[PDB]
Every structure is written in C-alpha cells, then in structure tokens.
C-alpha cells in the first residue's frame, strides 16, 4: 500500500538539450594565407637561384677537367 512508483522526470526539470547547428568559423583570412604562400615561393626561388648558380660553376669546373684530359 506504499506510494505509487512510476518512471517519471526528476523534481523541477531535466537539463536543457542542445539542438541547433554548431559550426565554428575556425580559420585565418584569405590575405594571410596568400601572403604566406607567396613568401614561401619567393624564399624557395632565391634558394634555388643560389644553388643553381653554384651547380653551374661546378659543371664548368668538371668540363675544364675534361678539356685538360682530352689531348
């Protein structure tokens, strides 16, 4: 003869439940990304310039060794 016991919601109420779309912005601006890309390209160009000039000098040296040995 005890009290009625049934599955029921708790005293007061259940906590609020989220349902709305949540997609944060989470990114840099286009200007920053373009600037970083162009800077990387320029740095690579200058490094390649130095290395290619050094390689040209090395090729000239090897060709001169061949010229010395040819006769």
Partner 1 sequence: AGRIASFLKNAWAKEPVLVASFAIGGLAIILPSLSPYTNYAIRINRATPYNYPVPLRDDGNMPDVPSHPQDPQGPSLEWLKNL
Residues that bind partner 1 (CB under 8 A): 53, 56-57, 59-60, 63-64, 67, 70
Cβ at position 24, least distance to partner 1 in Å: 25
Nearer to partner 1, 18 or 61 (CB): 61
Nearer to partner 1, 43 or 59 (CB): 59
Rounded to whole angstroms, what are the CA distances from 62 to 45, 47, 48, 65?
Answer: 26, 23, 21, 5
Q: State the virtual CA torsion across 9, 15, 19, 25 in degrees, nearest 10.
A: -170
Nearer to partner 1, 4 or 67 (CB): 67
């Amino acid at each position: 003869a005890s009290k009625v016991k049934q599955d029921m919601p708790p005293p007061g109420g259940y906590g609020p439940i989220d349902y709305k779309r949540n997609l944060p912005r989470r990114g840099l601006s286009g200007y920053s990304m373009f600037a970083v890309g162009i800077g990387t390209l320029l740095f690579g160009y200058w490094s390649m310039m130095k290395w290619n000039r050094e390689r040209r000098r090395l090729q000239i040296e090897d060709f001169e060794a061949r010229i010395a040995l040819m006769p």
